[PDB]
Amino acid sequence: RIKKISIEGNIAAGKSTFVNILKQLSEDWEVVPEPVARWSNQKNGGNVLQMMYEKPERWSFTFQTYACLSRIRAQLASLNGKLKDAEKPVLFFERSVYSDRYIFASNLYESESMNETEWTIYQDWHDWMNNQFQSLELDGIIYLQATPETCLHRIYLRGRNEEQGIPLEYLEKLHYKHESWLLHRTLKTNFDYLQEVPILTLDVNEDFKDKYESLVEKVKEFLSTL
Amino acid sequence: RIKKISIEGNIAAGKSTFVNILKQLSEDWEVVPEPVARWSNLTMSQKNGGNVLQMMYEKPERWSFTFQTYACLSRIRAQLASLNGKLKDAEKPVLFFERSVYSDRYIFASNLYESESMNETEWTIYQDWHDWMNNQFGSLELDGIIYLQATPETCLHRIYLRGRNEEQGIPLEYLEKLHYKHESWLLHRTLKTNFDYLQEVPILTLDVNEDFKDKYESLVEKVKEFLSTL
Ligand SMILES: O=c1ccn([C@@H]2O[C@H](COP(=O)(O)OP(=O)(O)O)[C@@H](O)[C@H]2O)c(=O)[nH]1
Ligand SMILES: O=c1ccn([C@@H]2O[C@H](COP(=O)(O)OP(=O)(O)O)[C@@H](O)[C@H]2O)c(=O)[nH]1
Ligand SMILES: Nc1nc2c(ncn2COCCO)c(=O)[nH]1
Ligand SMILES: Nc1nc2c(ncn2COCCO)c(=O)[nH]1
């Protein structure tokens, strides 16, 4: 019954900003915040992130596993309780277990922070988790598209250190992974329904926090197409 | 309708012998062997288990979390497939599980945490991964437990007897630790778990010290005695 739409975007692209604004506009509009963000600054979540920063080749499996499990737990609790009640309920997933795997876990394998066996076991469990703990299927995706330069700027326009603004080439790689997944629909996934799911792309390069009506108009009619 | 019964015991107790004896006796009895015994000797599962088995023997404080999480998932999958994917049919259906999600957690994992092969974060993560899942999925709760009790010396003797290498045995001291953990769970019942039907689950304890390959009738009789009380 409850509508489910994940917000996607590269690091610091403006998802939390967008999702916090989106939730304020309707009592029908509810959100599930991303577990990774806020693990920075429960105890298990602080630890893995720091070690993962300190040494990605040791903790990427452990981290990627606990993050996807945290997201699933979170997304069930606001589904099996929160808002509805509501007349036309929509639940905005701040990121998803698809970008958990096909963006972040995948990048870590590709910079050799997980070896082949970590990454196959991860990819196996992923299926088994999504298949057992089913009704998480998205009806739409909203992609907040931005240039890697904008995100580089926005990481700086936030709070750098502790997190820091990493390489621009690291942002380009996640950019091209986001573009290849959401803009071009070429990434092949085990979850067949994804090819048959609507995507709203949003050029978020221009600043929006005090001027976002045009973005919400696009979101409201995208919602109407569902 | 299916009875779910675990076969537990120290390493080289003869769990795998015993379960392979019980499967030959009754049409209503079936076996779910150790996913982890098929990783000693083409299905990425075996490719992955094969690889995480050796890495673990080569570096336990690097690999304990990954091995333990993988073993438990594989066992959960094997229990789910055997169960609602078998013979029923059957008059008095019984499924023996060779070990359980519970030896995985309170024998092996806990032992690895006590030995610094997992840090606090890992052990805590493992535990809420195990807590969450065996409540979400797990049908696999048990109608009973059978306790095959041997001494660590019989166990080390039998480790030697089996095959060794990539499975191996070595320390008599380690077997002693595991042997002690099984008593607290299954014989004194002082080991309190995160599962409260388990403080109260019926437990059959079979002394398997003396070889039972050619003399198993009295043990099988007790099992039968035990099942028809469940
Ligand atoms: O239109 C925008 C969107 C974001 N930001 C800033 O960029 C930083 C990162 O944005 P956010 O946390 O929302 O990014 P996320 O990682 O959640 O996508 C924050 O300081 C925002 O204030 C901005 O100045 N204008
Ligand atoms: O009554 C017995 C039971 C066990 N074995 C041998 O003990 C070894 C270890 O047994 P198993 O692998 O079944 O022990 P498990 O790990 O399954 O408890 C094997 O080589 C068995 O053939 C034996 O000689 N006599
Ligand atoms: N959303 C998300 N972020 C991750 C993951 N792994 C590492 N990060 C880094 O998060 C900080 C930037 O979003 C993951 O699996 N999901
Ligand atoms: N059956 C089983 N064997 C394990 C496990 N972990 C390691 N091994 C292999 O045995 C050596 C440690 O006792 C486990 O969780 N289950």
Curated annotation (Swiss-Prot), chain B:
Substrate binds at residues 34, 57, 68, 99, 104, 167. The modification Phosphothreonine is found at residue 43. The active site is at residue 98. Its main location: nucleus. One of its GO terms (molecular function) is deoxycytidine kinase activity. It is found in: Nucleus. The keyword Ribonucleoprotein does not apply. ATP binds at residues 9-17, 158-162, 210-212. GO terms for cellular component: cytoplasm; cytosol; mitochondrion; nucleoplasm. It comes from the Eukaryota. Keywords: ATP-binding, Kinase, Nucleotide-binding, Nucleus, Phosphoprotein, Transferase. The keyword Ribonucleoprotein does not apply. It catalyses: 2'-deoxycytidine + a ribonucleoside 5'-triphosphate = dCMP + a ribonucleoside 5'-diphosphate + H(+); 2'-deoxyadenosine + ATP = dAMP + ADP + H(+); 2'-deoxyguanosine + ATP = dGMP + ADP + H(+). The modification Phosphoserine is found at residue 45. It holds the Pfam family dNK. GO terms for biological process: dAMP salvage; nucleoside phosphate biosynthetic process; pyrimidine nucleotide metabolic process. Phosphorylates the deoxyribonucleosides deoxycytidine, deoxyguanosine and deoxyadenosine. Has broad substrate specificity, and does not display selectivity based on the chirality of the substrate. It is also an essential enzyme for the phosphorylation of numerous nucleoside analogs widely employed as antiviral and chemotherapeutic agents. Belongs to the DCK/DGK family. PANTHER family: DEOXYCYTIDINE KINASE (PTHR10513:SF19), DEOXYNUCLEOSIDE KINASE (PTHR10513). Homodimer. This is Deoxycytidine kinase. The lineage of its organism: Eukaryota, Metazoa, Chordata, Craniata, Vertebrata.
